[PDB]
């Protein structure tokens, strides 16, 4: 029923084309991507347990041609395995192409391609920051609501080979056991406080001791000793998260116990940051591939 290869081919054929060229799928094609990916999200666990090797990517925010560059340099599925950490939509000009390609690859390679929820995969955020406006302009309001029902089923965290804990935002003062994540039921909205909110919204901070108020007005900051205690208690080596723009595309925290990944270079056309993805090989050797406009 879903002409999945046709969709992917049309999404990929604009690579190198006229700058900023749209790919306009049909609304039935997009509804099909949402419906079939939603089934797959709900059939897989909300806390993904993954094996290496894979490549991990941070925020994209609708920068569709940067997403295509990520695949060009990292390897198009299924040449490489992927975990994305969220924030696919808003701010950029091509949220629709971005999310449609990610959902298509999720359907095409369901056990080798993974998408986590970011704080922008939430209707009360992406109504404001661009995605709803893009849906209304290029399709209609009903399609935006279809996306929301799909996003409400995204998984929330991943653990790679029992050593790398991955989520969009960060730690939570309410996260004592991984079972608390596994117990979250879907579909769900993102609440204004609590575990699920923190996993999508919190940030590390070099200046806080323990837990502090987050400048965003949502959730918390956490310091380097919170990170160390969490890793020791759960026998983990690394937290891998996204959510903050960082100048070099990746940024270490607390003596390599945490890394922030951000995959949208020159974010909003306002910053002069690189994008990065992290390659994790079969032995959990971790390295960075850095994408930057030439200067």
């Amino acid at each position: 029923s879903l002409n999945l290869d046709s969709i992917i081919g049309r999404l990929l054929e604009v690579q190198g084309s006229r700058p900023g060229k749209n790919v306009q799928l049909t609304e039935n094609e997009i509804r099909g991507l949402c419906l079939k990916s939603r089934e797959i999200f709900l059939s897989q666990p909300i806390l993904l347990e993954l094996e290496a090797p894979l490549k991990i990517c941070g925020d994209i925010h609708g920068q569709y041609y940067d997403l295509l560059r990520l695949f060009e340099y990292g390897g198009f599925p299924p040449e490489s395995n992927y975990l994305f950490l969220g924030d696919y939509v808003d701010r950029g000009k091509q949220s629709l192409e971005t999310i449609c390609l990610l959902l298509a690859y999720k359907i095409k390679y369901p056990e080798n391609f993974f998408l986590l929820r970011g704080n922008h995969e939430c209707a009360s955020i992406n109504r404001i920051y661009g995605f709803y406006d893009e849906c209304k302009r290029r399709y209609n309001i009903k399609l935006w609501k279809t996306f929301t029902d799909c996003f409400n089923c995204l998984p929330i965290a991943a653990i790679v080979d029992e050593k790398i804990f991955c989520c969009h935002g960060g730690l939570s003062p309410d996260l004592q056991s991984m079972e608390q994540i596994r117990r979250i039921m879907r579909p769900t909205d993102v609440p204004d406080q609590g575990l699920l909110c923190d996993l999508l919204w919190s940030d590390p901070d070099k200046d806080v001791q323990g837990w502090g108020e987050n400048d965003r007005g949502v959730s918390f900051t956490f310091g380097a000793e919170v990170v160390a205690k969490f890793l020791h208690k759960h026998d983990l080596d690394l937290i891998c998260r996204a959510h903050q723009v960082v100048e070099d595309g990746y940024e270490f925290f607390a003596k390599r116990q945490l890394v922030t990944l951000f995959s949208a270079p020159n974010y909003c056309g306002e910053f002069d940051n690189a994008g990065a993805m992290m390659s994790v090989d079969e032995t959990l050797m971790c390295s960075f591939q850095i994408l930057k406009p030439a200067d």
């Binding site: 993954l50 094996e51 290496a52 560059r69 080596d237 971790c286 390295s287 850095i290």
Partner: peptide, 26 residues
């Protein structure tokens, strides 16, 4: 060949940590 279900995270030498890709912006 799916990856959905004792190792240790480690890092390369400093010169092999980053691989750069440059692109022309329009």
């Amino acid at each position: 060949k799916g990856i959905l279900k004792r190792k240790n995270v480690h890092w390369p030498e400093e010169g092999k940590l980053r691989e750069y890709f440059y692109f022309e912006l329009d």
